[PDB]
């Protein structure tokens, strides 16, 4: 049994209400949010059911993956380490931990299926530079996994169930909106494949579920310096309805893997407000979270990367 480190990286989420300030200050490059901003951020977390369940998902995903990988093959024993971008344990901390435990070989994976220079590449770079600084630790990094058959099927099956559940009439006038986290539009100057990968994910899911009509949109953009990738899901819904009058909208935020704020609020609240206003039905299938089907897809991605 070869010992290998499994570095699972993610954006990060506060652990308790008192972390919101520092968590958002970090995301905003040092600009701590105004008292008024802080206050409603808390309100949003409360509306969605609370903060603590949020961070648990990432930990559960990492541990279930570890446990699953170690059961499906007999050559390697994986040890999972979580490295986050906006709250401890940060990426550097997780790498330092691995080095401390005597890990010399590691494989990394970001919990976001699509690659981006702004996101994934940045995480991978941080993980590798730290390892390099410490020395004696080598890391092979997965860059994207949106096209993993097992991951595509999870969403294909969820879309099928949803379309099957709606009345024939809504089923006749339904629109599938596939989305991911918006990023500054400037990434395109670097030839960033992020937009293309999202569109490809949308094609993969729609075709597998037999959906002829679907659209791609973005959500959760930032503090507008230069424009961010658009169109936003809120605007896209309005637009699409005024044009063809879709009686139902199914949101598949394929860019996200858990029941986090950007799904529970930006979709379940913000998009629902729009559908409620226009009198259309709102549908948003369950996120993969730590579901066995999902953990199996992640294990396969990691095994393929190592050629096992």
Domain boundaries, the chain: 1-145+288-308, 146-287
Is 230 part of any known ligand binding site?
A: no
Q: Resolution in angstroms for this experimental structure? A: 1.9
Evaluate whether 84 touches 72 at the Cβ level (below 8 Å): no
The rounded distance, in Å, linking the Cα atoms of 140 and 306 is 8
Is 83 part of any known ligand binding site?
A: no
Give me Rg for the CA atoms of the chain. 20
The rounded distance, in Å, linking the Cα atoms of 228 and 206 is 25
Is 18 part of any known ligand binding site?
A: yes
The CATH classification number of 146-287 equals 3.40.50.1400
Is 68 part of any known ligand binding site?
A: no
Is 268 part of any known ligand binding site?
A: no
Is 259 part of any known ligand binding site?
A: no
Peptide bond into 7 cis (omega under 30): no
Is 262 part of any known ligand binding site?
A: yes
Is 1 part of any known ligand binding site?
A: no
Residue range 1-145+288-308 forms a domain whose CATH class is alpha beta
Is 22 part of any known ligand binding site?
A: no
Name the method of structure determination. Answer: X-ray
- Domains 1-145+288-308 and 146-287 agree in fold: yes
The rounded distance, in Å, linking the Cα atoms of 123 and 143 is 10
């Amino acid at each position: 049994r070869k010992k290998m480190g499994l570095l699972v990286m993610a954006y990060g989420t506060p652990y308790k209400e008192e972390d919101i300030e520092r968590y958002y200050t970090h995301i905003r490059r040092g600009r701590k949010p105004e008292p008024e901003m802080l206050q409603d951020l808390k309100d949003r977390y409360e509306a969605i059911g609370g903060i603590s369940p949020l961070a648990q998902i990432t930990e559960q995903q990492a541990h279930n993956l570890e446990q699953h990988l170690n059961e499906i093959q007999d050559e390697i024993t994986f040890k999972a380490y979580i490295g986050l971008k906006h709250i401890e344990p940060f990426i550097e901390d997780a790498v330092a931990e691995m080095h401390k435990d005597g890990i010399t070989e590691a494989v990394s994976i970001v919990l976001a299926p699509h690659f981006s220079t702004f996101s994934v590449q940045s995480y991978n770079k941080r993980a590798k530079e730290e390892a390099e600084k410490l020395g004696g630790l080598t890391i092979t990094s997965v860059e994207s996994w949106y096209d993993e058959p097992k991951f595509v099927t999870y969403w294909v099956d969820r879309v099928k169930e949803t379309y099957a559940s709606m009345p024939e009439d809504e089923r006749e006038n339904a629109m599938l909106i596939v989305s991911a986290h918006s990023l500054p539009e400037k990434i395109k100057e670097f030839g960033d494949p992020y937009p293309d990968q999202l569109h490809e994910s949308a094609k993969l899911i729609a075709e597998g579920a037999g959906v002829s009509e679907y659209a791609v949109g973005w959500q959760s953009e930032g503090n507008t310096p230069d424009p961010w990738l658009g169109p936003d899901v809120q605007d896209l819904t309005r637009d699409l309805f005024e044009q063809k009058g879709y009686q139902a909208f199914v949101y598949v935020p394929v860019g996200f893997v858990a029941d986090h704020l950007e799904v529970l609020y930006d979709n379940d609240y913000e998009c629902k407000v729009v559908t409620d206003d226009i009198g259309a039905s709102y549908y948003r299938p369950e996120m993969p979270n730590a579901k066995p089907e999902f953990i199996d897809a992640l294990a396969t991605v990691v095994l393929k990367k190592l050629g096992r």
